[PDB]
C-alpha cells in the first residue's frame, strides 16, 4: 500500500499555504473559497499533487496515507466536548482547509445537511453524550446512490495510536460463480436514520424507502470489482440460496482480510469508498482535551449527479 | 449566454504555454501527461480558470465560448485528407493540448474505442469518402441536432470543440431548454420513465466484439438495455431547472402513451424553435453541456484542398470510474 512522506520543506510549505488561506477567506461559508479550491490546491507541493492524482487514476488501492504534516498542537488547542453550538471556524481552520484542498484534487467536497449541522468538514472526537464492543466495518452509506466516492481522514491527534480498520477485496479467494451472483440485483440494503437529533427533494429516496429495490454488491469490472458492503444493513431473500451463499463468502473474504491502519498525528488517510470498507476500534476516552481528534471530508467525483436531492445548484449539501 | 473574450496578452500566454507543453511531452499516449493535466491547466490565465469553474459550478447555461485564441495557421498546416495514417501527434499538437487542459478543468477527458482509433482529441474535417454520411467527417448532409449518445448511461457530460479553422464561418447549431415554454403537466410526464431511446449502431454489442469472457462482461449493461428495452425519462435532475436527453432520431414514444406523445411534441417544438446558430470561428473554443444543450451542424460544401473547416473535439466525463465496467483496464480512458 503506497504512501507519501512529506519532507520538512514540503510540510512547512503545506503549513504556510494552509495559514495564508486561513486568513484570506473567513470560512467555508464563502462561495469564492469553494470556487477557488482546485486552483488553490495547485499551489500545494507538486509531489503531493502528483501522488494523489496517481492514487485517483490508478484505481487499484482502497486507501492511501500522506504522512508527516505539521499540525500545530498549540494553535489547534484542546479537543472539544461537542460539535454543536461550537462556533465555526475554530483555530484548526488551517487543517480543515487542507482536507478541503485534498478533496478538490480528488473531486468535490460534499456533505449531509442532517449530519453535524451540514458542515463540509466533520469532527471525530470522543463525546460523553454519545458514549461489550463489536468490531464493525462498512462501506460508507452503502445503500445510497449518492454515497461518497472517497473519504478523507486527517488526524489532528491520536495520542494512544488508536487504529482505523480498512479492508479490500481479494478476488482470488472467491469463485467465479459467487462473483457473478454478487454482480446481480439480488440484495436489499437498508437506509439509516440521522433524523431530528421540498416536495420533490425528500421524495427521491422514497424508491428505496417504499418499494425497497434489490441491487448488486459487486459492480464495475468483473476482473477488479468495486463493492458496496454494509453487513449490518444487508438483507438477502430467504428463497435465494445462491445469493446468501455468495454474500457469506464475500463477508468472510472481507472480514478475514481486514487491516489495522493507524492515522497518527500529521497523517491524512484517504479511503476509496468503492474499493475499501472501513471501521472504528473501541478505545478508552479521557475527555480532558487531549483525546484522539480527526477531521473528515466526503468526496464526490460527480457533484451534479446528486442535483435532485440538493436544495439549489450551488449547495454541496444533500437532504 | 456568457462568453469569455481573451485579450491579446492572454491569448499570447495560452499559446506560449501550449507550445511549451508540446515540446515537453511526447503525445497523449504518455500517461504522465494525462496525470499532469489539471496541474498544467492551473498555468492558464486566471480569468479563464475562474470563468470555466463558474460555468461548471453554476450548472445553468447549456453552452459557453472562450473566444480569441491565437491558433498559428502556418504551424498548424493544411487540413488533412483523413484521420487515418497521420503522424501522431501532428503539428497542431499545441491546440489539442489546450482542449485537454480545458477538459481537465471541467472533468476528465475520455473517448470511445471505436471512434477515430481511440484518440482522446479527435478531428472534425471533411473526408471525401464520407461526403454522403450524416456524421462529423461529413459536409453535404445536415447534421441534425441532438444530445450526444442520449441512450448511453456513460455519455459525455460536456463537449469541447476547438476551431482550428472555419474559413466560411459554418455555424454549429446549439439549443437549450426554455422550461417556461412547457406546461407543468408536460414536465411531470417528461420526468417519468415513459420513453425508449435507441442506441447508435456503434454502441451495439453485436456490432463490435465481444468474444471471450472479459469483453462480453464489458457490454453486459448495454446488452440488457437492448434485451429489456427499459423506458426512461427525457428530463431529469431538478424539476425547476431540469437536465435533458433529447435525440429525436433515436427516441420512441410508445403508441399507446398519449400523454407522453403530447409532452414529447411539446418538448421538441420548444427546443427546435430555440435553436441557436453559434459560429466557432478560428481561435474559438466551444463548450457544450451535454445535459443542458443539444447540438448539430449546418450543411456545407467541402473543397478537399487542405483549406477546409477543421475542429478538434474532446469528450468530458465528470466521473471516469462510473464507466469502469466498459473499460478494458483501470488506466484506459477508452470505453469499449
Ligand atoms: Fe463510516
XYZ file of C-alpha atoms and ligand atoms in Angstrom:
656
model
C 0.000 0.000 0.000
C 1.739 3.171 -1.316
C 2.159 6.187 0.967
C 3.753 9.633 0.801
C 6.056 11.011 3.495
C 6.418 14.805 3.214
C 9.838 16.422 3.650
C 10.181 19.146 6.306
C 10.290 21.615 3.387
C 7.105 20.108 1.987
C 5.473 20.026 5.433
C 6.492 23.672 6.010
C 5.170 24.745 2.577
C 1.882 22.940 3.268
C 1.610 24.542 6.727
C 2.415 28.030 5.358
C -0.111 27.878 2.498
C -2.709 26.499 4.905
C -2.291 29.592 7.155
C -2.158 32.108 4.267
C -5.504 30.664 3.110
C -6.958 30.563 6.651
C -6.551 34.368 6.646
C -7.662 35.137 3.079
C -11.142 33.608 3.485
C -13.486 33.816 6.500
C -14.995 30.323 6.357
C -16.294 27.625 4.000
C -19.448 29.778 4.011
C -17.565 31.857 1.441
C -18.655 30.838 -2.096
C -15.350 32.105 -3.565
C -13.288 29.661 -1.447
C -15.294 26.645 -2.652
C -14.898 28.026 -6.193
C -11.114 28.534 -5.850
C -10.434 25.127 -4.228
C -8.927 23.452 -7.365
C -6.800 26.493 -8.280
C -5.701 26.751 -4.643
C -4.810 23.051 -4.388
C -2.473 23.679 -7.331
C -0.216 25.693 -5.003
C 0.460 22.611 -2.869
C 3.877 20.946 -3.383
C 3.915 19.313 -6.832
C 4.977 15.931 -5.394
C 1.852 15.816 -3.217
C -0.464 16.764 -6.104
C 1.134 14.108 -8.293
C 0.889 11.489 -5.541
C -2.870 11.970 -5.071
C -3.580 12.054 -8.811
C -1.742 8.746 -9.256
C -3.850 7.269 -6.435
C -7.029 8.592 -8.085
C -6.224 7.374 -11.614
C -4.623 4.037 -10.668
C -7.933 2.899 -9.138
C -6.086 -0.037 -7.545
C -5.806 0.717 -3.815
C -8.526 1.003 -1.211
C -6.598 3.575 0.831
C -3.517 5.763 0.939
C -1.764 7.956 3.538
C 0.054 11.294 3.236
C 2.279 11.344 6.352
C 4.388 13.970 8.128
C 2.171 17.090 8.128
C 2.934 19.875 10.556
C -0.120 20.198 12.806
C 0.482 22.956 15.366
C -0.839 21.404 18.599
C -0.505 24.748 20.433
C -2.580 26.564 17.789
C -5.174 23.782 17.285
C -5.979 23.832 21.005
C -7.782 21.265 23.190
C -10.082 18.537 21.866
C -13.635 19.986 22.183
C -16.577 18.479 24.099
C -19.236 18.757 21.382
C -19.599 19.907 17.782
C -22.943 21.683 18.172
C -23.184 25.295 19.379
C -19.420 25.480 18.829
C -18.682 28.431 16.519
C -17.044 27.701 13.151
C -14.346 28.092 12.078
C -12.098 27.301 15.059
C -8.291 27.614 15.390
C -7.942 24.330 13.448
C -9.301 26.166 10.369
C -5.919 25.734 8.612
C -6.160 21.931 8.945
C -9.746 21.835 7.652
C -8.784 23.866 4.560
C -6.000 21.363 3.858
C -8.510 18.485 3.856
C -10.709 20.655 1.613
C -7.739 21.245 -0.693
C -7.116 17.476 -0.943
C -10.818 16.943 -1.711
C -10.670 19.416 -4.620
C -7.873 17.293 -6.100
C -9.809 14.007 -5.788
C -13.121 15.527 -6.898
C -15.644 17.655 -5.000
C -16.372 18.222 -1.290
C -19.968 17.467 -0.309
C -21.878 16.835 2.928
C -25.139 15.733 4.515
C -27.357 18.614 5.634
C -28.682 16.496 8.538
C -25.147 15.426 9.576
C -23.407 17.818 12.012
C -25.395 20.948 11.017
C -24.343 20.131 7.441
C -20.684 21.006 7.931
C -18.452 20.136 4.999
C -15.712 19.179 7.473
C -16.765 16.545 10.036
C -15.443 16.228 13.570
C -14.336 12.885 15.020
C -13.726 13.038 18.786
C -14.931 11.249 21.961
C -18.217 12.620 23.343
C -19.622 11.587 26.742
C -23.184 12.163 25.483
C -22.887 9.731 22.552
C -20.822 7.272 24.585
C -19.011 -5.313 25.036
C -17.980 -3.595 21.788
C -18.460 -5.226 18.380
C -15.927 -4.661 15.592
C -17.965 -3.411 12.622
C -16.616 -2.433 9.219
C -18.590 -0.930 6.376
C -18.871 0.923 3.127
C -19.959 4.496 3.879
C -23.700 4.917 3.172
C -23.634 1.677 1.131
C -27.377 1.914 0.365
C -27.206 5.433 -1.056
C -26.764 6.081 -4.787
C -25.034 9.397 -3.948
C -22.694 7.980 -1.291
C -19.108 9.274 -1.025
C -16.617 8.170 -3.645
C -13.706 8.982 -1.328
C -13.220 9.616 2.388
C -10.514 11.968 3.685
C -9.429 11.420 7.310
C -6.898 13.902 8.716
C -5.528 13.084 12.171
C -5.102 16.251 14.255
C -4.061 13.974 17.143
C -4.131 10.293 18.154
C -2.038 10.030 21.369
C -2.755 6.332 22.016
C -2.283 5.394 18.329
C -5.826 4.094 18.004
C -6.043 2.396 14.587
C -8.682 2.589 11.871
C -9.742 -0.667 10.222
C -9.734 -0.863 6.415
C -10.393 -3.903 4.219
C -10.198 -4.509 0.483
C -11.477 -7.358 -1.694
C -9.208 -10.276 -2.593
C -10.766 -11.774 -5.752
C -8.616 -14.927 -5.776
C -10.489 -16.097 -2.668
C -13.895 -16.019 -4.403
C -15.189 -18.398 -7.077
C -16.391 -17.167 -10.492
C -19.866 -18.449 -9.554
C -20.054 -16.301 -6.388
C -18.670 -13.255 -8.235
C -21.340 -13.365 -10.966
C -24.131 -13.784 -8.396
C -22.873 -10.781 -6.369
C -22.886 -8.685 -9.573
C -26.668 -9.207 -9.864
C -29.565 -7.208 -8.290
C -30.418 -9.721 -5.549
C -29.636 -7.872 -2.290
C -31.513 -5.335 -0.167
C -29.581 -2.650 1.659
C -31.490 -0.697 4.309
C -31.256 3.094 4.851
C -30.131 4.872 8.039
C -31.839 7.275 10.469
C -29.977 10.529 11.366
C -33.420 12.134 11.825
C -34.203 15.042 14.178
C -31.475 14.949 16.869
C -39.060 20.398 -0.642
C -41.708 18.040 -2.072
C -39.510 16.642 -4.866
C -36.322 16.534 -2.755
C -37.280 14.177 0.091
C -39.484 12.011 -2.166
C -36.391 10.820 -4.072
C -35.202 8.141 -1.609
C -38.869 7.058 -1.480
C -37.982 4.453 -4.122
C -35.578 2.817 -1.651
C -37.955 3.560 1.250
C -41.371 2.491 -0.125
C -40.626 -0.077 -2.850
C -37.275 -1.308 -1.440
C -35.370 -2.410 -4.587
C -32.715 -5.129 -4.846
C -29.232 -4.113 -6.020
C -25.798 -5.727 -6.513
C -22.920 -5.880 -4.003
C -20.180 -6.002 -6.634
C -20.096 -3.785 -9.741
C -17.686 -2.202 -12.249
C -15.135 -4.588 -13.767
C -15.559 -8.328 -13.145
C -11.781 -8.779 -13.031
C -11.318 -5.971 -10.468
C -14.752 -5.124 -8.968
C -15.931 -2.241 -6.840
C -18.038 -3.013 -3.769
C -20.849 -1.713 -1.567
C -20.875 -3.667 1.676
C -22.521 -2.817 4.982
C -23.244 -6.227 6.608
C -25.436 -4.739 9.358
C -27.950 -3.264 6.877
C -27.664 -6.000 4.226
C -30.574 -8.382 3.532
C -30.951 -11.378 1.215
C -34.276 -13.067 0.330
C -34.553 -16.404 2.161
C -35.501 -18.264 -1.040
C -32.362 -17.045 -2.860
C -29.781 -19.604 -1.683
C -27.160 -18.719 -4.317
C -27.136 -15.061 -3.209
C -26.982 -15.994 0.500
C -24.059 -18.372 -0.173
C -22.187 -15.755 -2.233
C -22.810 -12.982 0.309
C -21.489 -15.255 3.068
C -18.283 -15.936 1.108
C -17.907 -12.226 0.312
C -18.280 -11.349 4.005
C -15.692 -13.969 5.016
C -13.083 -12.792 2.490
C -13.549 -9.161 3.546
C -13.651 -9.847 7.307
C -10.571 -12.120 7.223
C -8.609 -9.552 5.204
C -9.329 -6.564 7.473
C -6.225 -4.478 8.176
C -5.420 -2.185 11.084
C -4.123 1.203 9.941
C -3.083 3.922 12.374
C -3.732 7.537 11.472
C -1.175 9.194 13.758
C -0.916 12.958 14.261
C 0.223 14.523 10.978
C -1.283 11.757 8.828
C -4.081 12.099 6.302
C -5.730 8.786 5.401
C -7.532 8.562 2.070
C -10.160 5.842 1.689
C -11.659 4.703 -1.610
C -15.316 4.130 -0.669
C -15.717 1.802 -3.688
C -12.690 -0.397 -3.067
C -12.404 -0.410 0.734
C -14.644 -0.931 3.733
C -13.611 0.756 6.976
C -14.459 0.896 10.662
C -13.640 2.144 14.152
C -11.829 0.398 17.001
C -13.076 0.891 20.598
C -10.838 2.924 22.922
C -10.702 4.429 26.422
C -11.527 8.157 26.172
C -10.140 10.790 28.569
C -12.437 13.827 27.970
C -9.793 16.273 29.273
C -8.965 17.851 25.888
C -6.083 15.570 24.868
C -8.226 12.894 23.154
C -7.924 11.486 19.624
C -9.199 14.055 17.104
C -9.686 13.523 13.382
C -11.367 15.642 10.716
C -13.410 14.137 7.885
C -14.451 15.307 4.404
C -16.655 13.354 1.976
C -15.702 13.459 -1.712
C -17.980 13.049 -4.723
C -16.497 12.643 -8.205
C -19.741 13.926 -9.731
C -21.422 16.831 -7.909
C -24.232 17.137 -10.490
C -25.413 13.522 -10.247
C -26.990 14.328 -6.861
C -28.752 17.509 -8.125
C -32.311 16.283 -7.415
C -31.504 15.819 -3.701
C -29.884 19.249 -3.408
C -31.816 22.406 -2.492
C -30.216 24.549 -5.206
C -27.458 24.361 -7.831
C -24.873 25.946 -5.501
C -25.194 23.914 -2.267
C -22.939 20.900 -1.639
C -25.356 19.544 0.960
C -27.694 16.594 0.414
C -31.104 16.295 2.091
C -25.365 33.338 -22.619
C -21.881 34.070 -21.196
C -18.639 34.055 -23.164
C -15.015 34.940 -22.467
C -13.028 37.109 -24.841
C -9.269 36.715 -24.450
C -7.046 39.799 -24.559
C -4.120 39.509 -26.988
C -1.924 39.175 -23.860
C -3.942 36.219 -22.502
C -4.016 34.644 -25.989
C -0.218 35.004 -26.173
C 0.338 33.305 -22.794
C -2.067 30.474 -23.675
C -0.244 29.981 -27.000
C 3.211 30.059 -25.310
C 2.069 27.537 -22.705
C 0.693 25.129 -25.330
C 3.983 25.322 -27.299
C 5.914 24.686 -24.089
C 3.863 21.568 -23.209
C 4.007 20.310 -26.812
C 7.801 20.306 -26.571
C 7.952 18.774 -23.066
C 5.557 15.845 -23.684
C 5.672 13.110 -26.337
C 1.986 12.552 -27.042
C -1.338 11.780 -25.365
C -0.006 8.204 -25.113
C 2.216 9.433 -22.266
C 0.330 8.621 -19.010
C 2.317 11.299 -17.142
C 0.716 13.972 -19.387
C -2.816 12.741 -18.568
C -1.793 12.669 -14.888
C -0.312 16.204 -15.083
C -3.302 17.718 -16.935
C -5.105 19.525 -14.061
C -1.871 20.854 -12.514
C -0.896 22.062 -16.013
C -4.312 23.681 -16.518
C -3.578 25.780 -13.402
C -0.910 27.537 -15.507
C -3.586 29.038 -17.810
C -4.638 32.699 -17.321
C -6.550 33.007 -14.033
C -9.563 34.700 -15.624
C -10.114 31.722 -17.930
C -9.830 29.367 -14.942
C -12.415 31.378 -12.974
C -14.722 31.684 -15.983
C -14.826 27.922 -16.645
C -15.060 26.999 -12.955
C -18.059 29.360 -12.688
C -19.679 27.808 -15.767
C -19.099 24.302 -14.348
C -20.419 25.193 -10.875
C -23.323 27.427 -11.954
C -24.950 24.450 -13.709
C -27.354 26.804 -15.507
C -26.154 27.574 -19.045
C -26.078 24.908 -21.722
C -23.058 26.305 -23.536
C -20.272 28.851 -23.448
C -17.449 30.049 -25.703
C -13.920 31.231 -24.989
C -13.054 33.479 -27.937
C -9.832 34.931 -29.323
C -7.120 32.235 -29.123
C -4.020 32.573 -31.258
C -4.032 29.466 -33.459
C -0.896 29.760 -35.638
C -2.082 28.777 -39.144
C 1.455 28.360 -40.540
C 2.422 25.946 -37.754
C -0.926 24.094 -37.898
C -0.695 23.475 -41.661
C -3.129 22.067 -44.268
C -6.395 20.437 -43.196
C -5.720 16.688 -43.570
C -7.438 14.399 -46.087
C -8.118 11.733 -43.446
C -7.523 10.990 -39.775
C -6.135 7.536 -40.632
C -2.406 7.270 -41.350
C -1.355 10.620 -39.896
C 1.816 11.093 -37.866
C 0.598 11.446 -34.279
C 0.880 13.905 -32.770
C 0.783 16.278 -35.735
C 1.869 19.945 -35.938
C -1.435 21.012 -34.275
C -0.411 19.253 -31.015
C -0.376 22.563 -29.057
C -4.104 23.134 -29.804
C -5.005 19.553 -28.845
C -3.156 20.065 -25.562
C -5.199 23.213 -24.978
C -8.516 21.382 -25.219
C -7.135 18.685 -22.908
C -6.177 21.348 -20.353
C -9.706 22.722 -20.629
C -11.250 19.272 -20.188
C -9.209 18.713 -17.010
C -10.776 21.905 -15.611
C -14.272 20.574 -16.400
C -13.654 16.893 -15.581
C -11.770 14.030 -17.216
C -11.137 13.517 -20.944
C -12.296 10.185 -22.341
C -13.026 8.601 -25.713
C -14.779 5.761 -27.478
C -12.583 2.893 -28.598
C -14.372 2.658 -31.970
C -14.065 6.405 -32.694
C -11.022 7.504 -34.729
C -8.663 4.800 -33.333
C -9.409 5.834 -29.728
C -7.795 9.283 -29.984
C -8.832 11.354 -26.987
C -8.791 14.536 -29.070
C -10.461 13.758 -32.373
C -10.864 15.508 -35.696
C -13.818 17.171 -37.390
C -12.992 17.870 -41.049
C -14.495 16.790 -44.405
C -13.358 13.452 -45.808
C -14.359 12.818 -49.450
C -15.474 9.205 -48.927
C -17.657 10.440 -46.030
C -19.419 13.114 -48.078
C -22.818 11.360 -48.033
C -22.620 10.425 -44.328
C -24.634 12.134 -41.590
C -21.580 12.242 -39.316
C -18.852 14.630 -38.096
C -16.489 13.948 -41.012
C -19.297 14.782 -43.474
C -20.133 18.119 -45.100
C -23.008 17.962 -47.621
C -25.519 16.381 -45.226
C -27.211 18.359 -42.444
C -26.087 17.162 -39.026
C -29.440 17.340 -37.226
C -29.422 18.426 -33.577
C -29.217 16.100 -30.601
C -27.868 15.248 -27.203
C -24.701 13.190 -27.796
C -25.305 9.458 -27.153
C -28.679 10.106 -25.470
C -29.221 6.393 -24.805
C -25.844 5.776 -23.165
C -25.510 5.891 -19.377
C -21.850 6.952 -19.696
C -22.400 9.506 -22.491
C -20.408 12.759 -22.359
C -21.182 15.243 -19.605
C -19.506 18.013 -21.619
C -18.131 18.513 -25.120
C -15.195 20.716 -26.003
C -14.959 21.924 -29.590
C -11.947 23.951 -30.737
C -11.948 25.584 -34.162
C -8.545 25.440 -35.849
C -10.106 26.995 -38.940
C -13.570 27.868 -40.264
C -12.928 29.918 -43.440
C -16.606 30.050 -44.492
C -17.915 30.577 -40.930
C -20.037 27.436 -40.920
C -22.124 27.580 -37.732
C -22.655 24.872 -35.156
C -26.280 24.687 -34.058
C -26.893 24.597 -30.311
C -30.238 24.586 -28.492
C -31.288 24.829 -24.851
C -34.459 24.138 -22.843
C -36.703 27.104 -22.052
C -38.688 25.484 -19.227
C -41.263 28.307 -19.001
C -42.454 27.340 -22.503
C -43.762 23.971 -21.236
C -46.842 23.204 -19.134
C -46.364 21.746 -15.641
C -48.210 18.550 -16.631
C -45.895 18.001 -19.633
C -42.774 18.466 -17.470
C -44.101 15.878 -14.976
C -44.628 13.373 -17.815
C -41.177 14.014 -19.349
C -39.736 13.278 -15.896
C -41.277 9.814 -15.835
C -39.904 6.547 -17.313
C -42.114 6.591 -20.422
C -39.685 6.803 -23.364
C -37.452 4.394 -25.242
C -34.161 5.668 -26.547
C -32.395 3.585 -29.174
C -28.611 3.119 -29.160
C -26.484 4.388 -32.040
C -25.182 1.378 -34.006
C -21.578 1.968 -32.876
C -22.726 1.019 -29.348
C -24.323 -2.304 -30.224
C -22.544 -5.262 -28.515
C -23.334 -7.359 -31.612
C -21.634 -4.686 -33.757
C -18.242 -4.573 -32.009
C -16.658 -7.704 -30.477
C -17.012 -9.324 -27.838
C -15.906 -12.996 -27.999
C -14.186 -14.248 -24.780
C -15.347 -13.779 -21.160
C -13.621 -10.442 -20.438
C -15.075 -8.484 -23.376
C -18.590 -9.946 -23.099
C -18.799 -8.706 -19.493
C -17.720 -5.280 -20.800
C -21.040 -4.832 -22.645
C -23.349 -6.640 -20.182
C -25.250 -3.482 -19.183
C -25.763 -2.306 -22.789
C -26.831 -5.852 -23.718
C -29.585 -5.901 -21.071
C -30.681 -2.391 -22.096
C -31.215 -3.819 -25.589
C -32.844 -7.068 -24.355
C -35.292 -5.468 -21.893
C -35.828 -2.084 -23.567
C -36.371 -0.147 -20.318
C -38.314 3.087 -20.606
C -36.668 6.247 -19.295
C -37.315 9.969 -18.766
C -36.349 12.772 -21.158
C -35.977 15.280 -18.317
C -34.178 14.656 -15.017
C -32.349 16.293 -12.087
C -34.237 19.296 -10.711
C -37.861 19.870 -11.728
C -37.209 23.637 -11.595
C -34.183 23.583 -13.943
C -34.013 20.097 -15.484
C -31.288 18.281 -17.373
C -32.388 16.846 -20.731
C -31.502 13.987 -23.064
C -33.018 14.560 -26.474
C -32.041 12.781 -29.663
C -35.214 12.948 -31.811
C -33.898 10.282 -34.222
C -33.468 7.561 -31.590
C -36.442 8.412 -29.361
C -39.516 6.162 -29.462
C -42.742 7.310 -27.871
C -44.895 4.231 -27.163
C -48.006 4.438 -29.378
C -50.487 3.885 -26.531
C -48.955 6.552 -24.262
C -50.951 9.591 -25.421
C -49.707 11.871 -22.611
C -46.067 11.045 -23.460
C -46.640 11.811 -27.160
C -48.244 15.177 -26.323
C -45.412 16.133 -23.944
C -42.704 14.946 -26.367
C -44.164 17.001 -29.241
C -44.272 19.937 -26.826
C -40.627 19.438 -25.769
C -39.417 19.032 -29.366
C -41.196 22.206 -30.510
C -39.672 24.279 -27.679
C -36.107 23.053 -28.328
C -36.378 23.310 -32.130
C -37.647 26.915 -32.076
C -34.981 27.873 -29.516
C -32.142 26.573 -31.724
C -29.237 28.991 -31.985
C -26.533 29.225 -34.627
C -23.176 29.647 -32.876
C -20.150 30.298 -35.082
C -16.979 28.688 -33.822
C -14.535 30.799 -35.816
C -10.758 30.388 -35.847
C -9.488 30.585 -32.258
C -12.886 29.864 -30.716
C -13.339 27.059 -28.208
C -16.942 25.918 -27.780
C -18.099 24.333 -24.534
C -21.359 22.356 -24.646
C -23.137 20.938 -21.578
C -24.453 17.578 -22.808
C -27.090 17.634 -20.052
C -28.500 21.078 -20.863
C -27.920 21.514 -24.601
C -28.431 19.731 -27.885
C -26.117 20.491 -30.803
C -25.777 19.925 -34.518
C -24.218 21.472 -37.616
C -25.456 23.021 -40.864
C -24.570 21.513 -44.290
C -21.617 22.975 -46.209
C -19.698 22.319 -49.440
C -16.204 20.953 -48.844
C -13.204 21.758 -51.021
C -10.834 18.872 -50.117
C -7.821 21.100 -50.882
C -6.325 21.362 -47.385
C -8.157 24.600 -46.566
C -11.345 23.086 -45.099
C -13.048 23.736 -41.765
C -11.114 21.881 -39.062
C -12.250 21.297 -35.496
C -10.829 19.360 -32.562
C -13.199 17.522 -30.242
C -12.806 16.234 -26.676
C -15.461 14.369 -24.688
C -15.540 15.176 -20.958
C -16.815 12.957 -18.125
C -17.389 14.192 -14.568
C -16.776 10.646 -13.293
C -14.333 8.337 -15.073
C -14.905 5.361 -12.754
C -18.643 5.280 -13.453
C -17.792 3.717 -16.837
C -15.315 1.182 -15.388
C -17.321 -1.892 -16.455
C -16.861 -0.782 -20.086
C -13.142 -0.057 -19.917
C -10.531 -2.782 -20.573
C -8.213 -1.627 -17.753
C -8.418 0.847 -14.857
C -5.949 3.171 -16.613
C -7.637 3.342 -20.045
C -9.945 6.261 -20.884
C -11.492 4.347 -23.782
C -14.968 2.865 -23.479
C -15.483 -0.341 -25.474
Fe -18.244 5.227 8.472
